[PDB]
Structures are given as structure tokens and as C-alpha cells.
Coordinates of C-alpha atoms in Angstrom, one line a residue:
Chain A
X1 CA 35.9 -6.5 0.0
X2 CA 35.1 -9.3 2.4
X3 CA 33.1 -7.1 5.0
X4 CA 30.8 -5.8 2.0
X5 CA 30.1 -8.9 0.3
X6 CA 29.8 -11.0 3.7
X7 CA 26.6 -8.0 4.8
X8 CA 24.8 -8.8 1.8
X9 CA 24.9 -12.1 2.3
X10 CA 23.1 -11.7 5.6
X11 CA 20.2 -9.9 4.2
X12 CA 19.3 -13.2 2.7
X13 CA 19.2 -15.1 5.6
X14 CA 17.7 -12.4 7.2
X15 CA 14.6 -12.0 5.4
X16 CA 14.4 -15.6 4.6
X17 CA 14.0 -16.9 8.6
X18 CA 12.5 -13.2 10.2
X19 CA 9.1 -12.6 8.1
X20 CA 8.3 -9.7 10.5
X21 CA 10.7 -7.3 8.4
X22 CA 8.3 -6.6 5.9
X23 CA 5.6 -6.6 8.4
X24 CA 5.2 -3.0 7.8
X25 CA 4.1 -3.6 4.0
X26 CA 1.7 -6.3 5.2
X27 CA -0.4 -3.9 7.6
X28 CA -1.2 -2.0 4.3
X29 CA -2.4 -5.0 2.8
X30 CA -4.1 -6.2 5.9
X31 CA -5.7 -2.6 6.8
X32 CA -7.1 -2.7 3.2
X33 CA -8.6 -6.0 3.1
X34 CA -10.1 -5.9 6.7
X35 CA -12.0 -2.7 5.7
X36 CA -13.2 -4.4 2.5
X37 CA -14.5 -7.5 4.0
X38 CA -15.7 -5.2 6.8
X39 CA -18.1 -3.1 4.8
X40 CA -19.1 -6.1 3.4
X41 CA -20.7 -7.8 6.1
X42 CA -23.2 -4.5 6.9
X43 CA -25.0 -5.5 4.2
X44 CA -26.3 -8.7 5.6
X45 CA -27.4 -6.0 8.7
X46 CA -31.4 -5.2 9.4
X47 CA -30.0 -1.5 10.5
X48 CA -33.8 -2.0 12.3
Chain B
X1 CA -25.5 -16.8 -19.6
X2 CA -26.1 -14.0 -17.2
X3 CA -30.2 -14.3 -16.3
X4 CA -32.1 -14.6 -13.0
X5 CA -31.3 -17.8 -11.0
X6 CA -33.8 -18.9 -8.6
X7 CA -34.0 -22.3 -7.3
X8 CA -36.3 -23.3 -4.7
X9 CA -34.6 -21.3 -1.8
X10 CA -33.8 -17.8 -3.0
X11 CA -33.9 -15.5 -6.2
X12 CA -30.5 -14.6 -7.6
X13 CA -28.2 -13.4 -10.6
X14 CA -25.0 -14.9 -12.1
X15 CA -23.7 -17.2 -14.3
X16 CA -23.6 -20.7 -13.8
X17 CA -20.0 -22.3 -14.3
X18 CA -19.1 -26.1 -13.4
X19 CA -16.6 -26.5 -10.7
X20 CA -15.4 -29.2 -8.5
X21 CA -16.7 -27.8 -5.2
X22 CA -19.1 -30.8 -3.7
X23 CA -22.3 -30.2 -1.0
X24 CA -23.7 -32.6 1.4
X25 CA -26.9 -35.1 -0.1
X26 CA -28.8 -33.2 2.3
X27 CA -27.0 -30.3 1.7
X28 CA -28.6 -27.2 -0.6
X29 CA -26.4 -24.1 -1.0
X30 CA -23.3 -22.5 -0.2
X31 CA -22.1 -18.9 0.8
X32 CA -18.1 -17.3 0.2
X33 CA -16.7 -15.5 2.7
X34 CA -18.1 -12.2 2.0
X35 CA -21.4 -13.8 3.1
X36 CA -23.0 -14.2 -0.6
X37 CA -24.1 -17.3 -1.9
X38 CA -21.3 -18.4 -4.7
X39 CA -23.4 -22.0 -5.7
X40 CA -26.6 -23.6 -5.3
X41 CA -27.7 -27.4 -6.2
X42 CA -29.6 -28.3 -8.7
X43 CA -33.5 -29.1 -6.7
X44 CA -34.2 -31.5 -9.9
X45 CA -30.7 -33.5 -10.9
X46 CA -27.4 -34.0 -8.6
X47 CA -24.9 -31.5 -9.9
X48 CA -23.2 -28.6 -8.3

């Protein structure tokens, strides 16, 4: 009962001070929105 | 209203909304970050 509850209690404090945890959801985010704005800026191209 | 909006630098479409972004006095237009222009000053009166 105490080894349980004291684990959970360390997922708080772990996701609170280490952001990089969820770092793996943010590259899907970051990935999109890089592609976005990318094929954006071509439009503001010559192409020649 | 959704029309054409030209003034004195560029033709353009939108719709014109009041916000609290400011230019410089010298200062004419403005672009996002997508490279578009999101306001231009009035050429006539001061407003934004």
C-alpha cells in the first residue's frame, strides 16, 4: 500500500520538472507545423 | 465586408477588423509570420 501510492506520487513530480517526457508527442506537433509554415514560404518564391 | 482592399502599396482581399496592433508614423504595413500581409494603414487618416 505504501510502495504503490508512494510511485504515483512520483509521476507528478516527474512530469512537472522533466518536460522532455512528452517530447515524443511534441515532434508530431512540431513535424506538422514546420511542414505547414514550410510550404508556405514557396509561395513568396520566383521558381525563375 | 469582404471586397478588394488596395491602398496605395498593394491590391488585396479581406476584411477589415479594428485591433490594437500599432505601426510606426512612418511606418505603412505589416506582414504575419506566414509572410502575408495581415494590416495596412490607412494612406488618408491615422488608424490601424
Amino acid at each position: 500500500a505504501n510502495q504503490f501510492n508512494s510511485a504515483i506520487g512520483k509521476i507528478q513530480d516527474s512530469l512537472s520538472s522533466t518536460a522532455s517526457a512528452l517530447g515524443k508527442l511534441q515532434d508530431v506537433v512540431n513535424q506538422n507545423a514546420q511542414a505547414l509554415n514550410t510550404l508556405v514560404k514557396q509561395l513568396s518564391s520566383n521558381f525563375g | 465586408k469582404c471586397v478588394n482592399f488596395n491602398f496605395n502599396g498593394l491590391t488585396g482581399t479581406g476584411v477589415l477588423t479594428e485591433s490594437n496592433k500599432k505601426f510606426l508614423p512612418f511606418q505603412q504595413f505589416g506582414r504575419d509570420i506566414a509572410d502575408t500581409t495581415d494590416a495596412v494603414r490607412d494612406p488618408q487618416t491615422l488608424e490601424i
